[PDB]
């Protein structure tokens, strides 16, 4: 049923001037071949070439076919063959006693060659002498790719009761055309060539003298690739003749399929040719007696109570061993250290705002207790574990929103929480029964783009206004006070902060990007290059840390924690609230409308997480494993409401460090995206991190806080490459002459791509502005209103095939 | 073994390339145009009959195509 | 240097005596921005950007325009000294 196939040449070694056998490759279902060095490549799909097949026709039309000859050993074989070469007149018999030595040498295998030194080709000559070729010679086409254990798994495969064939190729200078033997024994036959048990049918000779268009080699791999077919094979099992054997050699060349150099290769026009490959298949198992073996939504309404969740179990929970396992290259580890501090700055500076803000009801150690929980439960647990989960802006503005609603009504504030985390609960529980997520589906392109580059524009904001008050805080003066205290905090204006922390920042992204540049480049080995480069932030990290710490006198902001995992505020709060009454009892109007923040809170983290979802997943990424959505939803929303039962916050999941943890784990090719690891290991580690971030004090309390910056910097850079919106803009300002190749420039006409970036830009600008406004709670309300102005009103203005080529759901298919 | 549709289709093949197009500009006799034939002849691979997946074998031989092309233009 | 403390009493009329609070940086900060800017319009030149006149027209005049604008940038600032050019006075 399947078979092996070696080949043997004539060839010539480095230790002495010398003729001897050397096997060159091996077939089973499969071509595997071996360079200098003696080890064998990776076995591939063998590629025939035109000269090889043309010449493999062109002798086998006046082959000379000897068929169930009896005989035991090659030597017998070999005298036979050349009487039959005598009597069909294909050479002449004074070459009889060189040809006779021509077959007869040792046939070694590849372990003695390393002792050997290695083998080259050489040519037989009257005489009996090696000689180099005349003509000239190029590479071979596999050995570079393939080659730039093993036996084991071919004794594997190899089933115990089988049977081998062999092809015995040379040049010889002294011959006039190149003859071909094709001998099957009556009886199956060990034989000393092949050092492998396993005994041997049938048998190939291949020689000639030197002719343009003729490869020696490429004849022999021609010859095996003949001799790996199954109906072929099954032919010479029944053959009888030689005209048998041409019937089968033109059955065979009939149901081939040849394709021509082309200017421009590319797959997606490539994956077209499937069907007529099957069908050549079908052709040639049209004529054969044998035949041949081989001949889901995230997101959908089901009729079954419940049925989301169990779909995204089934379909995710499966790949928890691989999961496990896919986790231990080094990029995870860099991705690890990047994702820390990428989550770990923000939970302070949420931490610490909150803390001012609420009269400490809220600081840092219950938010880092919280985001570090929340990790590690969801990706325990989570359906898709890529996503990060991390406090936000629009909680905070809520919770400022809460706390003054409180404060001016006289009632509490931490004790409601808990009845809206109920509510919250209760809400998730009832949507997920009822798979309420399938209206992710209507939300577009449009929205995913709209939302993702407003983020990554507020984030850049933020930062901006950050350094900005920062350098507010130490204007740039004549002269300044030197008797000023700095122990609570810098007191006055300082002479060296502000600047030395705008270059500070500076030299961060400015390495930043000579790294990630340096990564893509040709200039080491590759194995270090890589590495090198995909570690090139905590590299730049440490680089900054050590610069700083080699500075003495000029003072720098630094990283703070808290003391230990004490609340907040001990004078009014507990680790336990009790839901009927902290210090007076609760209403019971209040318990009753708590339902109304509770619907808002829920509205917030439901397109928060679907729209982070959608971005995170779409289908150009390269990922592999299914993603779910009820799942993830349910588990963050019901263990946000049990957070915020004991008086913790309630957290979602977040834009910007998702994408960057999706990208950090991506491994990319020469650019393409080659894979995407997703595994659950990293999420847990960063959780990790973050929770016992407050046992580093002696560390951290050595890094400036400039240092995040780049980081802040290099994030909002790299978030913004996806974004199509962000094209189009960079499209708005080249001519017409420059613009480029994909589809949505090429079917409808310029001035229209500007129109629709100009309503897009519109949109933003309102969006912006509504957040400026001190209406701001109504922002994601107005950002879901974007979908009936693409379902109705669009469709009144532009056409439908202009729709479809511009608010392409997906980016290779329009 | 001869359809003249199929011959038509490697003739029209053959004169969609443009470096054979460019010597068919500058050909002046049938010596050179059968050289260049044979060149272009020369970097060309088949694929015979496996029962491999059929995705799989199409997408091994995409870098052989890369190599292979540029070792035409040399 | 960079130190702790400065004298604010130094006479600086033919040339700073003793350390000074933000020159270095501000000096750094500069020469970095100029470098930048130099290298930006250069990349500009070339790029595809802008209608052809105007690009080149644009990217001609980089090293006069990052020049004019980063001495601006540095007579904005009234308190902070950076060394300047002098030349004699007459032939």
Not at 116 to 122: C, D, M
Not at 628 to 652: E, N, T
Not at 754 to 774: D, E, N, R, Y
Request: proline share 6%.
């Amino acid at each position: 049923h399947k078979v092996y196939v070696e080949l043997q040449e004539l060839v010539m070694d480095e230790k002495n001037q010398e003729l001897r056998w050397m096997e060159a490759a091996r077939w089973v279902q499969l071509e595997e071949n071996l360079g200098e060095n003696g080890a064998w490549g990776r076995p591939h799909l063998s590629h025939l070439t035109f000269w090889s097949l043309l010449e493999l026709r062109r002798v086998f039309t006046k082959g000379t076919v000897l068929l169930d000859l009896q005989e035991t050993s090659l030597a017998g074989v070999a005298n036979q063959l050349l009487d039959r070469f005598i009597f069909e007149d294909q050479i002449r018999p004074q070459d009889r006693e060189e040809l006779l030595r021509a077959l007869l040498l040792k046939h070694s295998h590849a372990g003695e060659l390393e002792a050997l030194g290695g083998v080259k080709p050489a040519v037989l000559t009257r005489s009996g002498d090696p000689s180099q070729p005349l003509l000239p010679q190029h590479s071979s086409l596999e050995t570079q790719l393939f080659c730039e254990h093993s036996p084991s798994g071919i004794l594997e495969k190899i089933p115990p009761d089988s049977e081998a064939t062999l092809v015995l190729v040379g040049r010889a200078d002294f011959l006039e055309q190149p003859v071909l033997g094709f001998v099957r024994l009556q009886e199956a036959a060990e034989l000393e060539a092949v050092e492998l048990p396993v005994p041997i049918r049938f048998l190939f000779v291949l020689l000639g003298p030197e002719a343009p268009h003729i490869d020696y080699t490429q004849l022999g791999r021609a010859a095996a690739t003949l001799m790996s077919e199954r109906v072929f094979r099954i032919d010479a099992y029944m053959a009888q003749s030689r005209g048998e054997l041409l019937h089968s050699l033109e059955g065979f060349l009939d149901c081939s399929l040849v394709l021509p150099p082309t200017d421009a290769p590319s797959e997606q026009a490539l994956l077209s040719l499937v069907p007529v490959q099957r069908e050549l298949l079908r052709r040639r198992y049209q004529s054969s007696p044998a035949k041949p073996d081989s001949s889901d939504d995230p997101l959908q309404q089901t009729g079954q109570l419940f049925g989301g969740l169990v779909r995204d179990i089934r379909r995710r929970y499966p790949y928890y061993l691989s999961d496990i396992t896919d986790a231990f290259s080094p990029q995870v580890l860099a991705a690890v250290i990047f994702i820390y501090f990428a989550a770990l700055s923000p939970a302070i500076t949420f931490g610490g705002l909150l803390g001012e803000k609420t009269r400490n009801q809220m600081g840092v150690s219950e938010l880092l207790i919280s985001t570090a929980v929340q990790g590690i439960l969801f990706a325990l647990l989570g359906a898709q574990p890529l996503l990060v989960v991390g406090f936000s802006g629009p909680l905070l503005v809520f919770e400022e929103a809460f706390f003054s609603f409180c404060e001016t009504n006289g009632l509490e504030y931490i004790v409601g929480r808990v009845w809206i985390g109920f509510w919250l609960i209760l809400l998730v529980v009832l949507v997920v029964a009822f798979e309420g997520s399938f209206l992710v589906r209507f939300i577009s392109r449009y929205t995913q783009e709209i939302f993702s580059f407003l983020i990554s524009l507020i984030f850049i904001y933020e930062t901006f206004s950050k350094l900005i008050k920062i350098f507010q805080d130490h204007p740039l003066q004549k002269t300044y006070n030197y008797n000023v205290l700095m122990v609570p905090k810098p007191q006055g204006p300082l002479p060296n902060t502000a600047l030395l922390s705008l270059v500070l920042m500076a030299g961060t992204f400015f390495f930043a990007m000579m790294l990630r540049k340096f990564k893509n480049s040709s200039y080491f080995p590759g194995k270090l290059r890589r590495v090198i480069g995909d570690f090139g932030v905590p590299i730049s990290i440490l680089i900054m840390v050590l610069v700083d710490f080699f500075i003495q006198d000029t003072y720098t902001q630094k990283l703070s924690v808290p003391d230990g995992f004490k609340v907040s505020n001990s004078s009014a709060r507990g680790w336990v609230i009790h839901p009927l009454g902290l210090r007076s009892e609760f209403p019971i109007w209040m318990m009753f409308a708590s339902a109304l923040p509770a619907l808002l809170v829920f509205i917030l983290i439901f397109l928060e997480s679907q729209i982070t979802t959608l971005i995170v997943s779409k289908p150009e990424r390269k990922m592999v494993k299914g993603s779910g959505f009820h799942l993830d939803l349910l588990l963050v929303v019901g263990m946000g409401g049990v957070a915020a039962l004991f008086g913790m916050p309630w957290l979602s999941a977040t834009t910007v460090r998702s994408v960057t943890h999706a990208n950090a784990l991506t491994v990319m090719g020469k650019a393409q995206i080659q894979e995407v690891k997703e595994q659950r290991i990293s999420g847990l580690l960063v959780a990790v991190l973050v929770g016992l971030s407050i046992l580093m004090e002696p560390i951290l309390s050595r890094i400036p806080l400039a240092v995040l910056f780049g980081i802040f910097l290099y994030m909002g850079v790299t978030s913004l490459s996806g974004i199509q919106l962000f094209d189009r803009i960079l499209l708005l300002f080249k001519p017409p002459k420059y613009h480029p190749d994909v589809p949505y420039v090429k079917r409808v006409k310029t001035w229209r791509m500007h129109l629709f970036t100009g309503i897009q830009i519109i949109c933003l600008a309102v969006l912006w502005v509504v957040k400026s406004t001190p209406a701001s709670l109504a922002l994601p309300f107005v950002l879901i209103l974007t979908v009936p102005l693409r379902r109705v009103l669009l469709p009144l203005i532009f056409r439908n095939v202009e729709l479809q080529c511009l608010d392409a759901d997906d980016a290779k298919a329009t």
